[PDB]
Design an enzyme around this catalytic site. Structure first.
Site, short mmCIF file in Angstrom:
data_model
loop_
_atom_site.label_atom_id
_atom_site.label_comp_id
_atom_site.label_asym_id
_atom_site.label_seq_id
_atom_site.Cartn_x
_atom_site.Cartn_y
_atom_site.Cartn_z
N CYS A 54 0.83 -1.20 0.00
CA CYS A 54 0.00 0.00 0.00
C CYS A 54 0.87 1.26 0.00
CB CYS A 54 -0.91 -0.01 1.23
SG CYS A 54 -1.87 1.50 1.52
N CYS A 72 0.20 2.76 4.28
CA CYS A 72 0.81 2.06 5.40
C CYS A 72 1.91 1.10 4.98
CB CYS A 72 -0.26 1.32 6.21
SG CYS A 72 -0.73 -0.27 5.54
N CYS A 114 -5.68 -3.23 1.14
CA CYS A 114 -4.58 -3.27 2.10
C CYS A 114 -5.17 -3.52 3.48
CB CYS A 114 -3.79 -1.97 2.08
SG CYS A 114 -2.46 -1.86 3.30
N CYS A 125 -5.24 -0.84 6.80
CA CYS A 125 -5.35 0.54 6.35
C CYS A 125 -6.48 0.63 5.33
CB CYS A 125 -4.03 1.04 5.74
SG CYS A 125 -3.58 0.35 4.12
N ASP A 185 53.92 -42.64 13.01
CA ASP A 185 55.25 -43.24 13.02
C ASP A 185 55.44 -44.27 11.90
OD1 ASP A 185 53.70 -45.26 14.72
OD2 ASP A 185 55.68 -46.23 14.57
N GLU A 186 54.37 -44.89 11.40
CA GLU A 186 54.50 -45.64 10.16
C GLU A 186 54.53 -44.69 8.98
OE1 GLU A 186 52.83 -46.80 12.86
OE2 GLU A 186 54.62 -48.09 12.91
MG LIG Z 1 54.33 -47.93 15.16
ZN LIG Z 2 -1.42 0.18 3.37
#
Ligand SMILES: [Mg+2]
Ligand SMILES: [Zn+2]
Ligand SMILES: [Zn+2]
Lengths: 146, 110, 83, 49, 215, 146
Positions: free
Chosen positions: B5, B8, B26, B29, B91-92
């Site tokens: 609107c 509003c 609306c 309003c 470690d491997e």
């Molecule tokens: Mg190992």
């Molecule tokens: Zn309105």
């Protein structure tokens, strides 16, 4: 023997009809493969012999002079040449068949085997070495199937 | 729709009044936009979604190496796609996974 | 509850690894319980090794009762079970 | 993550095949004497051999 | 439109061919002259002028063959009937059972189009002398027996079942089972306690046979 | 409105034409419907497999279900270099499908025919299984290794 499903003999025309498949079929295929291998060796020797001009006796002879050795006309030269290239003695064939049959018999699963447990560990042990995340080759760009 | 609107600025809606008028009232309003032979149309474009070509394969772009596959008797492959991962403790050493370019057989040489 | 007669037998004539291990264990337990042995020891004291020696000489006086799943059983002596 | 995740998988597989053993008639049976395979692998052959 | 009709004639032709194969390998007097039906010939025989398939004049008589009747003494004729209405009602299967009982049919095949009423299951198993097998036109477009992943299921007579249960020294409870309403069991018409021989193939162990018992 | 299905099965997220390193353009679909794809025009239903074991089971049968299980497991470990003898996989498939239905290795699956309340309680869900067994007056024999 390959009895029927009701316990009768097959007619030799329905030997491989696929409704009479049973146990002993793996053993029959093993024997047939053994015969095929021996046939390959024999055919190799026969092809060599016929490539040397002399008769390649793949099939057994059948004539009136069948008893005589057909290698007599060969002048002692390509005979020793053939024996130099391929020389299969009967003891060798029997030893090979003995070894093969012994190995096939020994390969049979033994009663009492914890086959279920063995299969479980044989499927599970390789399962601890593979990643849960799917790792792919860099560049494939294929679908992301887990 | 997505219209509002002027008074509003609230979102406008279609309501059915007397004689079934599809006026754009609306809410909240006193605003009334009636329809007197006027067409309110809201058009939004949509994607075409063209065709997609064959997936095929892009293995030309993958790191190769000089390794003979375990199935060398069947296929004489001197090369194998690879990628290295450390799927062990630190470690491997690292683990290398392979794929023969001649058969596609995969194996891990660690 | 019916023993298969000896003249025909469907089970394997070869001794399984489990049969061998259990026969050795039983014979060794018997020897450890001061059972007489039918082999020449040559100074061996371990009942397990004495049992292995008797097995090598095939002088173990035990038979194997192999039960089929249907409930029957066929008896195989240690001597006739070929290794 | 794989450690524990795969650990149960192996135990679970065992729980299912815990009582599967080759019989003296060359059949694989449960502990209830029910047939799973009439011949192991359709061959009767040990993979170890 | 024309496309829907063309797809429908082709699809129902495929379903008819699958049904004919299914009743053929169950053991009955059917041959390739009616199995391998040229779609055009089937259309020129079961599709009328304006081109709508009609599903009342393909209901055919299936009779046991000499080998099948010799192996299985108790096997009567088969009725295969195709429905027209999408939803099967009470009246249609009622008159279908009427046909079965008034013509003394040992078994009857019902192949409807779309769906079956939830009240049908309360009316269908009420036949002492006969049995009713319930199929869909869309569910048998391709027969699963020709699939590469389906081994050759072979139905064994009571004699073969007894011989098998004695060769292995078994009770029925010890055999591996195959479900009722299993796709292959429905195809072959397996009844409870009917042992079926399975000819399965393996890459590393060759061709070998297993057995299953129907619940 | 601009989200509804007009053509194709409403079970396939997407289809994708693939090439098997040849001039054959096979297509594999990312869906959950196997019978529809099998019966679709221009698709050979004789050679049309899905990787979903339970989909195979409901459409093709328990034997095809165990075939799918064996092929899926073997392929899965063949893409990680896991050299397992196929007999272990065959036994896994047979123990999974010998009841006539595909039974899992999940807790619910283990309650297939075992009736062994001790083995079940050792596996998982101890208290509920024990109390159900006591309430039902179950009479389980002692036959399993557990
Ligand atoms: Mg190992
Ligand atoms: Zn309105
Ligand atoms: Zn290679």
């Amino acid at each position: 023997v390959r009895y029927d499903n009701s316990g009768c003999l097959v007619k030799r025309e329905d030997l491989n009809k696929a409704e009479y498949v049973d146990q002993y079929d793996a053993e029959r295929d093993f024997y047939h493969s053994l015969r095929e291998y021996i046939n390959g060796k024999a055919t190799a020797l026969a092809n060599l012999r016929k490539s040397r001009g002399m008769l390649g006796l793949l099939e057994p002879p059948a004539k009136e002079l069948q008893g005589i050795d057909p290698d007599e006309t060969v002048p002692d030269n390509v005979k020793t040449s053939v024996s130099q290239l391929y020389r299969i003695s009967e003891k060798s064939v029997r030893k090979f068949l003995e070894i093969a049959l012994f190995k096939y018999r020994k390969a049979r699963l033994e009663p009492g085997t914890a086959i279920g447990a063995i299969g479980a560990q044989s499927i599970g042990e390789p399962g601890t070495q593979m990643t849960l995340k799917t790792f792919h080759f860099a560049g494939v760009a294929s679908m992301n199937v887990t | 729709m997505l219209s509002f609107c002027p008074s509003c600025n609230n979102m406008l809606l279609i309501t059915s009044g007397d004689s079934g008028v599809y006026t754009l009232a609306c809410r909240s309003c006193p605003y009334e936009f009636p329809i007197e032979g006027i067409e309110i149309y809201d058009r939004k474009k949509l994607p075409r979604k063209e065709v997609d070509d064959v997936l095929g394969g892009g293995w030309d772009n993958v790191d190769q190496t000089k390794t003979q596959c375990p199935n060398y008797d069947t296929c004489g492959g001197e090369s194998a796609y690879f990628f290295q991962l450390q799927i062990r403790s630190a470690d491997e050493p690292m683990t290398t996974f392979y794929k023969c370019v001649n058969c596609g057989h995969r194996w891990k040489e660690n | 509850e019916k023993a298969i007669p000896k003249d025909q037998r469907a089970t394997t004539p070869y001794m399984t690894k489990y049969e061998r291990a259990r026969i050795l264990g039983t014979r060794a337990l018997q020897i450890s319980m001061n059972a007489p042995v039918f082999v020449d020891l040559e100074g061996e004291t371990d009942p397990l090794r004495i049992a292995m020696k008797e097995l090598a000489e095939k002088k173990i006086p035990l038979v194997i009762r192999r039960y089929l799943p249907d409930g029957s059983f066929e008896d195989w002596s240690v001597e006739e079970l070929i290794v | 993550v794989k450690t524990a995740e795969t650990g149960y998988m192996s135990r679970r597989l065992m729980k299912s095949l815990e009582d599967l053993s080759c019989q003296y008639d060359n059949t694989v049976r449960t502990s209830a004497n029910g047939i799973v395979q009439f011949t192991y692998g359709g061959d009767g052959l040990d993979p170890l051999e | 439109m024309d496309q829907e009709n063309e797809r429908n004639i082709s699809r129902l032709w495929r379903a008819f061919r699958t049904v004919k194969e299914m009743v053929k390998d169950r053991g009955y007097f059917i041959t390739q002259e009616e199995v391998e039906l040229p779609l055009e010939d089937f259309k020129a025989k079961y599709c009328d002028s304006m081109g709508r398939p009609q599903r009342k004049m393909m209901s055919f008589q299936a009779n046991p063959t000499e080998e099948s009747i010799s192996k299985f003494p108790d096997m009567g004729s088969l009725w295969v009937e195709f429905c027209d209405e999408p939803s099967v009602g009470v009246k249609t299967m009622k008159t279908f059972v009427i046909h079965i009982q008034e013509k003394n049919f040992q078994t009857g095949i019902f192949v409807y189009q779309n769906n079956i009423t939830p009240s049908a299951m309360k009316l269908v198993p009420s036949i002492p002398p006969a049995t009713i097998e319930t199929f869909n036109e869309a569910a048998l477009v391709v027969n699963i027996t020709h699939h590469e992943l389906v081994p050759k299921h072979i139905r064994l007579s009571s004699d073969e079942k007894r011989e098998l249960l004695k060769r292995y020294r078994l009770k029925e409870s010890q055999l591996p089972r195959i479900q009722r309403a299993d796709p292959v069991a429905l195809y072959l018409g397996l009844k409870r306690g009917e042992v079926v021989k399975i000819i399965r193939k393996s890459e590393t162990s060759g061709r070998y046979a297993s057995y299953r018992i129907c619940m | 409105l601009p989200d509804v299905v007009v053509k194709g099965l409403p079970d396939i997220s997407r289809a994708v034409i693939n090439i098997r390193d040849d001039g054959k353009r096979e297509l594999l679909v990312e869906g959950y419907g196997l019978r529809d794809v099998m019966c679709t025009d221009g698709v050979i239903g004789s050679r049309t497999t899905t990787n979903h074991v339970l989909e195979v089971f409901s459409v093709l049968g328990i034997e095809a279900a165990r075939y799918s299980i064996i092929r899926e497991i073997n392929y899965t470990m063949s893409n990680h270099g896991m050299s397992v003898d196929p007999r272990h996989i065959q036994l896994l498939g047979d123990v999974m499908t010998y009841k006539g239905e595909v039974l899992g290795i999940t807790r619910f699956g283990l309650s297939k025919m075992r009736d062994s309340v001790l083995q079940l309680a050792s596996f998982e869900k101890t208290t509920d299984h024990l109390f159900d067994a006591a309430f039902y007056m179950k009479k389980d024999a002692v036959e399993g290794v557990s």
